[PDB]
Amino acid sequence: PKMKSHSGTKKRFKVTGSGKVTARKAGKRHLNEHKSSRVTRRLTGETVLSKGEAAKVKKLLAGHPGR
Amino acid sequence: AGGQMPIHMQAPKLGGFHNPFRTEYQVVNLDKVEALFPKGGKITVDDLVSVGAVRDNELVKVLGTGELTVKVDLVVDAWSKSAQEKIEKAGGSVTK
RNA sequence: UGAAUGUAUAGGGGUGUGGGUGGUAACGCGGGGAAGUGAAACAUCUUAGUACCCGUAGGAAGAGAAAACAAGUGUGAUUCC
RNA sequence: GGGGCCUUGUGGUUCUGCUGCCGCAGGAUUGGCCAGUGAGAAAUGUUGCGUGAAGGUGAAGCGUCUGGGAAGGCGUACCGGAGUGGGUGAGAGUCCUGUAACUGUAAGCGUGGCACUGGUGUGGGGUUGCCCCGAGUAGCGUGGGACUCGUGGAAUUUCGCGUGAAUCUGGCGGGACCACCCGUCAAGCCUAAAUACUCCUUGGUGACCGAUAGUGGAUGAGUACCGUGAGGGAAGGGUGAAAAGUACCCCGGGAGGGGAGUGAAAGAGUUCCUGAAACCGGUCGCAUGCAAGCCGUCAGAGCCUGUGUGGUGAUGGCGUGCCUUUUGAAGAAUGAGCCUGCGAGUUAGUGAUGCGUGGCGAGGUUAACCCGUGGUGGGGGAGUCGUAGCGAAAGCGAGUCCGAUA
RNA sequence: GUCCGAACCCACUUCAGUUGAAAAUGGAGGGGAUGAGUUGUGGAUAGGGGUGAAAGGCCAAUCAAACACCGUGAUAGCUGG
RNA sequence: GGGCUUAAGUUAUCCGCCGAAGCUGUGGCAACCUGUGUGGUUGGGUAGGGGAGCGUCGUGUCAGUGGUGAAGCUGCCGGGUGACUGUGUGGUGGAGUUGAUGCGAGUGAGAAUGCAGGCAUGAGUAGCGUGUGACGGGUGGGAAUCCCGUCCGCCGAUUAUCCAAGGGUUCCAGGGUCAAGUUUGUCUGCCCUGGGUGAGUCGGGUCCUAAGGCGAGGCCGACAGGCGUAGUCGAUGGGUAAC
RNA sequence: CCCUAAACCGACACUGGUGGAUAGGUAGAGUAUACCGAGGCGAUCGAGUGAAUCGUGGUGAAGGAACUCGGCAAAAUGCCC
RNA sequence: AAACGACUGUUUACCAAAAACACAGGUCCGUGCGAAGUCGUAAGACGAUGUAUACGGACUGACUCCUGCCCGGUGCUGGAAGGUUAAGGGGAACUGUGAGUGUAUGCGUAGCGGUGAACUUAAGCCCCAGUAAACGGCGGUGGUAACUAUAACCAUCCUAAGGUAGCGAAAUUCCUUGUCGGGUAAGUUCCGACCUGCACGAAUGGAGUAACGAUUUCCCUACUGUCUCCACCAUGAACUCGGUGAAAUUGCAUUACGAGUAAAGAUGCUCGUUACGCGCAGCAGGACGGAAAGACCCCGGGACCUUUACUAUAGUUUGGUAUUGGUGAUUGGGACGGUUUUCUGAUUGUUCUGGUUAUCUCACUGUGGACCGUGAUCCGGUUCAAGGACAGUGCCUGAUGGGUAGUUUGACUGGGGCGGUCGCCUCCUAAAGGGUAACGGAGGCGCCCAAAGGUUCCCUCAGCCUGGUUGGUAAUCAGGUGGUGAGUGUAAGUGCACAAGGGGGCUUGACUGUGAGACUGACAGGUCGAGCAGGGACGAAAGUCGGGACUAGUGAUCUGACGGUGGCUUGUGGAUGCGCC
Numbered sequence A: 001p002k003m004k005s006h007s008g009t010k011k012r013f014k015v016t017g018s019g020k021v022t023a024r025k026a027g028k029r030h031l032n033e034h035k036s037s038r039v040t041r042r043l044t045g046e047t048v049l050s051k052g053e054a055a056k057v058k059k060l061l062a063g064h065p066g067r
Numbered sequence B: 001a002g003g004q005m006p007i008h009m010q011a012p013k014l015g016g017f018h019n020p021f022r023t024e025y026q027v028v029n030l031d032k033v034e035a036l037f038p039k040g041g042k043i044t045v046d047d048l049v050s051v052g053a054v055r056d057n058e059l060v061k062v063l064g065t066g067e068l069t070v071k072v073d074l075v076v077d078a079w080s081k082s083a084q085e086k087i088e089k090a091g092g093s094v095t096k
Numbered sequence C: 001u002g003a004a005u006g007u008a009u010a011g012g013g014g015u016g017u018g019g020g021u022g023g024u025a026a027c028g029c030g031g032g033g034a035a036g037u038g039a040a041a042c043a044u045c046u047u048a049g050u051a052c053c054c055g056u057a058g059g060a061a062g063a064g065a066a067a068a069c070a071a072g073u074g075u076g077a078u079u080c081c
Numbered sequence D: 001g002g003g004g005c006c007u008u009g010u011g012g013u014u015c016u017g018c019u020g021c022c023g024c025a026g027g028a029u030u031g032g033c034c035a036g037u038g039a040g041a042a043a044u045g046u047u048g049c050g051u052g053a054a055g056g057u058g059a060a061g062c063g064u065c066u067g068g069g070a071a072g073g074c075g076u077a078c079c080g081g082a083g084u085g086g087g088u089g090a091g092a093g094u095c096c097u098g099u100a101a102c103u104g105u106a107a108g109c110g111u112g113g114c115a116c117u118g119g120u121g122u123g124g125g126g127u128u129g130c131c132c133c134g135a136g137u138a139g140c141g142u143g144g145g146a147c148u149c150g151u152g153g154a155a156u157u158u159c160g161c162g163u164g165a166a167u168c169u170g171g172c173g174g175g176a177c178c179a180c181c182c183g184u185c186a187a188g189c190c191u192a193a194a195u196a197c198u199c200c201u202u203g204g205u206g207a208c209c210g211a212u213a214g215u216g217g218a219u220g221a222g223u224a225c226c227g228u229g230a231g232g233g234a235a236g237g238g239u240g241a242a243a244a245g246u247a248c249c250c251c252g253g254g255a256g257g258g259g260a261g262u263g264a265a266a267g268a269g270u271u272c273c274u275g276a277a278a279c280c281g282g283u284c285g286c287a288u289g290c291a292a293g294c295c296g297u298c299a300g301a302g303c304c305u306g307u308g309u310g311g312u313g314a315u316g317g318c319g320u321g322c323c324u325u326u327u328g329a330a331g332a333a334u335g336a337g338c339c340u341g342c343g344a345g346u347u348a349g350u351g352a353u354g355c356g357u358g359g360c361g362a363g364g365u366u367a368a369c370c371c372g373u374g375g376u377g378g379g380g381g382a383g384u385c386g387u388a389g390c391g392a393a394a395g396c397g398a399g400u401c402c403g404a405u406a
Numbered sequence E: 001g002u003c004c005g006a007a008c009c010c011a012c013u014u015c016a017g018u019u020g021a022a023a024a025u026g027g028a029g030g031g032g033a034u035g036a037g038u039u040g041u042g043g044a045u046a047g048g049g050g051u052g053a054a055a056g057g058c059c060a061a062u063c064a065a066a067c068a069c070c071g072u073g074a075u076a077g078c079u080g081g
Numbered sequence F: 001g002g003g004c005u006u007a008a009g010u011u012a013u014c015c016g017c018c019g020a021a022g023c024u025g026u027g028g029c030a031a032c033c034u035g036u037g038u039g040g041u042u043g044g045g046u047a048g049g050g051g052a053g054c055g056u057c058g059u060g061u062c063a064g065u066g067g068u069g070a071a072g073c074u075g076c077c078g079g080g081u082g083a084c085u086g087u088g089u090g091g092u093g094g095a096g097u098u099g100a101u102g103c104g105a106g107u108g109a110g111a112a113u114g115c116a117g118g119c120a121u122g123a124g125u126a127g128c129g130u131g132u133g134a135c136g137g138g139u140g141g142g143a144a145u146c147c148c149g150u151c152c153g154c155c156g157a158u159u160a161u162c163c164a165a166g167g168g169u170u171c172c173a174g175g176g177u178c179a180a181g182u183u184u185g186u187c188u189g190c191c192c193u194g195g196g197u198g199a200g201u202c203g204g205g206u207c208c209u210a211a212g213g214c215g216a217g218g219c220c221g222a223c224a225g226g227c228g229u230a231g232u233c234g235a236u237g238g239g240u241a242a243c
Numbered sequence G: 001c002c003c004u005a006a007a008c009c010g011a012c013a014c015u016g017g018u019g020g021a022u023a024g025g026u027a028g029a030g031u032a033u034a035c036c037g038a039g040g041c042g043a044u045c046g047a048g049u050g051a052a053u054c055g056u057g058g059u060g061a062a063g064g065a066a067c068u069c070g071g072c073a074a075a076a077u078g079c080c081c
Numbered sequence H: 001a002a003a004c005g006a007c008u009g010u011u012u013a014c015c016a017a018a019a020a021c022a023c024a025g026g027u028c029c030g031u032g033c034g035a036a037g038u039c040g041u042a043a044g045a046c047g048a049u050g051u052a053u054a055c056g057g058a059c060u061g062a063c064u065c066c067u068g069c070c071c072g073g074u075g076c077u078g079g080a081a082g083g084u085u086a087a088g089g090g091g092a093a094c095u096g097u098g099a100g101u102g103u104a105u106g107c108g109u110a111g112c113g114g115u116g117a118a119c120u121u122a123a124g125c126c127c128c129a130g131u132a133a134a135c136g137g138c139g140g141u142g143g144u145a146a147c148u149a150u151a152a153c154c155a156u157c158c159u160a161a162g163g164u165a166g167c168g169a170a171a172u173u174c175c176u177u178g179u180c181g182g183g184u185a186a187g188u189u190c191c192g193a194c195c196u197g198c199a200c201g202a203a204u205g206g207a208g209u210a211a212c213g214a215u216u217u218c219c220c221u222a223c224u225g226u227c228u229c230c231a232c233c234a235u236g237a238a239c240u241c242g243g244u245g246a247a248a249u250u251g252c253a254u255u256a257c258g259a260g261u262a263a264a265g266a267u268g269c270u271c272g273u274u275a276c277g278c279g280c281a282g283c284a285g286g287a288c289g290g291a292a293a294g295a296c297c298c299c300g301g302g303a304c305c306u307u308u309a310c311u312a313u314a315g316u317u318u319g320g321u322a323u324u325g326g327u328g329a330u331u332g333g334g335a336c337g338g339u340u341u342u343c344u345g346a347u348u349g350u351u352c353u354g355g356u357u358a359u360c361u362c363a364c365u366g367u368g369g370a371c372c373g374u375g376a377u378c379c380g381g382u383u384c385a386a387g388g389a390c391a392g393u394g395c396c397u398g399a400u401g402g403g404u405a406g407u408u409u410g411a412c413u414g415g416g417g418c419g420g421u422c423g424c425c426u427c428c429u430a431a432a433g434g435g436u437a438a439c440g441g442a443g444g445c446g447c448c449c450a451a452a453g454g455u456u457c458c459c460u461c462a463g464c465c466u467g468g469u470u471g472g473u474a475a476u477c478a479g480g481u482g483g484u485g486a487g488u489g490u491a492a493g494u495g496c497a498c499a500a501g502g503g504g505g506c507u508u509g510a511c512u513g514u515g516a517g518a519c520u521g522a523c524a525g526g527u528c529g530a531g532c533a534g535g536g537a538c539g540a541a542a543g544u545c546g547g548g549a550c551u552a553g554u555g556a557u558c559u560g561a562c563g564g565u566g567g568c569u570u571g572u573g574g575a576u577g578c579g580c581c
């Protein structure tokens, strides 16, 4: 049986060309009025995942290339 | 993750959408065209590159990393502006 | 032959004219349809249309000859891999 | 599209009707392009092959030696389209059964197929005046279900309840919906093969089991037995080549034994091949009745033996089991009466991700499937991974995105 | 639905039994003993159900949901190996 | 602890010694690093990681080997650093199997209140299931326990006699003493062989119905099925001829 | 053929359960109890032995509940006129 | 003599026989007969071949005397003035596409669609009554009688009403062995009272009660081995001999004692003491003896029970619609032309349609009679009677629904429970970097401010002393002194007098695109930030400004929403939906 990928992982993490695992920065979906432009800018890009989290993501992905 | 909200649920979903009709190009660069067609390669068609390596039955956009001292006439699907400029300056052309 | 009753019918009386009844390990088709379990609780969800049950076949069954796909040129019943 | 209206064409007819004494049709041994036992708007005999069920033929070795026995050793000959197996007193190509090869098949309800008999039977161009083209159907609403789709932007499909068409200048579909375009013609039906399975029958196979295994079942096995019942459910294989299965005598009521016989072997005697351990004892050597012992270990006299190595071992020192689980167990925490047997990290993915190793290499590799009825070999490149990335994407591309061609 | 008291039905106390004579009894007494009595034969009610002068009692010697088989090799962040 | 002040007690000082698997000496083994002819450093270990091997079974190939005796079992004499092992040497046994190199595992057990079998410990111990037997003779290899007899005792609203239900041959006769019988047994409800049960009237059917069951048609119910009429069964009852 | 059982239900040749019928004498109200009848049994390990101790019965000076949670157990009473 | 139950009975097979259950008697509620109720999907059936003196459910429980106050809550019964309220009916309006029109933008006819629905519309709920032998409830403060204690009594607060009769140290009384009396030599028990009823009380009945009870309790007498205080006798075992022959258990074994030590209670370890080998009968101190993977406690899981936990659902109920039809009125919404005057004001006929209501009857009712199938209490057909477009049933729809089902019901914790706590900020513990725990010790936060933000410029306070109208310690003025003790929006700490504290002017940087480089967390994440561009504020400039002297004032993801943009759109164009910010 083919082993399926994780759907949330499919939707949440990208894998770059060199193999890095990147996610969208968390904390900017709402409640943004009190957040400054500096805080919003800090939460506005992409984050390269740490070693253990990246290994967990590549395990959850079934050879899926991310999104 | 032991009960803590896991990584695949604390991270926001990458949104966006997928183009249902997107078609990828099999890209070839001018260094490859120079290496595989060195001897004044007159006309290079998709059949020729697919004979070397372009993975046939696909579109064959030609890109422009490399110098391309030789003169070539590439009839292919699509090209980059830099590749076209380099090809024309070398003395050749592109078509299709 | 034809009740109540009128047409008639229900019913009644002769003939065996043909078929049926029951069984069957798996496979088929149509229908009814769990829970444990997983979700580290649980109710949507899963298990699973599974287990079981009902009706009913055949040597296979079901489907099948476009009120179809496709996307601008085209393919041309179904089934199975 | 068909009907209707016509321009025409039926296989050569003996000659009967209706329409206009035009023409159309029933009609007939005799062609026939066809077409047949089929789904095909259908279903009735005599002749033509090879087979499964049974059979038939089926090659070719003797001499010596040892042994109970020769298939074994030694010597020397044959057959092979046959040396796959299995039996025979031990290990057989030539002893048997067979095997390869051919062969027969009366018979089948035989079965397949062919020939004849017998059975049934054509259209092409024009026209849209007119006529037909599947109705409580399709849609719609509502409550449910199947679709990747869990009610949604909900197409398609289906069940209950309501409501309810058009009909060719028409209906349906192309993911709400509309317009155009494309495709298609629902509400009638029948259709082989490729696919699934094995209670059964025939032949064969196995880096499958070998009596606690393999079926629950190698035997009176779904039996004994248990249960009111549904139901549950065992254990027990092996003498020997051949019963030649121990005549006869002795002790004994017998059982059993002792002589003897058979046998190669009886300590192979039916509780029968081999015959382990626990456990139970007879005999011999040493030690042992002043001694406190996780039972051993080191030091060590003496005795026996000496098969100059081995048995036992007075006495001295040191020394609180095994496992599990715990901060910590000799623990008075758990488990274990003992022995024998059995009892737990496996297998499947053209899964994920590493490593070793081999092949090929900017390329690598096939899947299903086809051929080899001779297999592990060959084809098959459909797909797939690599070959360029960045972006939500359009896209651009050694760049790309946020950005103002910053 | 009187009284005393055998058979019969029961089971209050005590002793024994407790690897029993017995998976509930024996000895000695004790209650009812014409009644809402007791008993033979056959029959009816069946599991979220039966039946219950009501104790969650009984439903084939363990019933706050029988037994058998099946889902099933249920699951166990627990114990053991 | 004995014992110790006549210190073997406290204290200061001095001189010796004992004392570990520590260190040194000597003889082996092993891991890593290092110049690559010195050698140096290192080698307790649970969970755990890594590396390399022993033994069992099947199997391709090669070389074989076995009644002049394979496997398995059991001794003795040896060997390796370990799992282990000899191509040493017997005994038993009676038909297979050895070495090299690969291939595949149902490949190793001490424990799971593990499963099956066999056998210990308790232990020649507890018990031998209410009770009254005694003697004379017989049978027999064997007699408290069998047979016969005489005394005596016991039940007698039952320790008697006869049925139903249930069981199923246990009944009788003869032969038997492996097993069963809580002991023995010559005996038996046990074993083996043979035999034994006779109905017009007795109990059932052939007659009748109760409760209840089933139920032509039928009615009800998606299916499965539920109920029920006409009927047909169904004794524990009615009827029916012998003492 | 067994049948208030050694043959049935209890795993047993089990001090338990099991429906019906016949059921005599003397004493007695009696089918209680005692001893007998019809008839059937001596019971399916025995033989001994004055141990403690346990079970089952018996008797008991003086006292008479002082026992004990509690008069538990036993004794006393008991029948007819 | 007391308690309980009236009595006879029944019950936890196998630890409870009772005071529990039942009972005869009582009351309430339901039921008009296809009864209600119950089993069943239904038909049927029981109820009952009964008929309100009957049947079913509930509670109480002979008999006697009685059974008090409260209808606020909840339930039940009735009612309907208003409010709210489903499906359905039905508007108005909006809107997609679209022939064409438009120099193009755009608009938009017909046709085919989409959206929600002003008005109308039931039960239920709110609401108003009744009902307690319905489920239930039946109080507080202050004080007063001629010893004192209490309160008949008074005032009050509040409630729906505030416990009546009777009983009371009780099967109820904590304190408690209450107090007093009786019984005994001595009585935590007893029985008679008292009333101070922690926390009796009138059909979950109150108080009594003859008779009854293997019920519970106390006393007297008789009687006794129950005892003082045991002794003796016989028996079945035990014991010996012959026969037969288990079991539980078992890591071992050549298995002493004392004081210690050790997983804190040692046959097994230490130091000592004692002890010849082996049996037989006995006893039970130990082997933390055996037996049973403790049943108490906690933790994880389950089961069953409850309810105003959640979510469902059978049943019950509401309306709409189908079955479902004929014939009249009486009231509103229209089209329609033509009295009025498209109209503030009114209309008749002529067609379409809501509501209210009234009759008819080969729809239907499984029904009462008769007849037929048939010589059958089933069933069916015909017919009469009785209803009747109702009911029943199907679908949709609101309400009700522990009758049933599936589940949830946190953790920390000096066991668990109760109480407390759970995120963030400041200080101490914290051992002079950072970090560091306890249910350790102190406090704060879940904001606020359009200025209390930005910039520029200016100023210095609190306290003290002296002089001065109201005026005093302290309003306001003047002189001296005073360096931080004042202040800081807000806890605390670190800071700030160069002020970051006080004031004046102008302002919106409380920006848009960014972020070299760093600090801090396992991570999600939190924090600081130079320089640059655009467009601004202040300043003469230097420059400063991406909120606030600093550090709390906050919430990932999913899902959905609004604004902008227009990247995608399943044949094309729209639409629609999605995407991005």
Ligand SMILES: [Mg+2]
Binding pocket: A029
């Ligand atoms: Mg957003």
Ligand SMILES: [Mg+2]
Binding pocket: A032, A035, A036, A037, A040
């Ligand atoms: Mg913002």
Ligand SMILES: [Mg+2]
Binding pocket: B003
């Ligand atoms: Mg959480």
Ligand SMILES: [Mg+2]
Binding pocket: none
């Ligand atoms: Mg389901």
Ligand SMILES: [Mg+2]
Binding pocket: none
């Ligand atoms: Mg579920």
Ligand SMILES: [Mg+2]
Binding pocket: C038, C039
């Ligand atoms: Mg779960």
Ligand SMILES: [Mg+2]
Binding pocket: C040
């Ligand atoms: Mg779980």
Ligand SMILES: [Mg+2]
Binding pocket: C058
């Ligand atoms: Mg067939």
Ligand SMILES: [Mg+2]
Binding pocket: none
């Ligand atoms: Mg078919």
Ligand SMILES: [Mg+2]
Binding pocket: D058
């Ligand atoms: Mg031959």
Ligand SMILES: [Mg+2]
Binding pocket: none
């Ligand atoms: Mg020979």
Ligand SMILES: [Mg+2]
Binding pocket: D150
């Ligand atoms: Mg779905």
Ligand SMILES: [Mg+2]
Binding pocket: none
């Ligand atoms: Mg649809």
Ligand SMILES: [Mg+2]
Binding pocket: none
């Ligand atoms: Mg459609």
Ligand SMILES: [Mg+2]
Binding pocket: D174
């Ligand atoms: Mg489309």
Ligand SMILES: [Mg+2]
Binding pocket: none
């Ligand atoms: Mg058609």
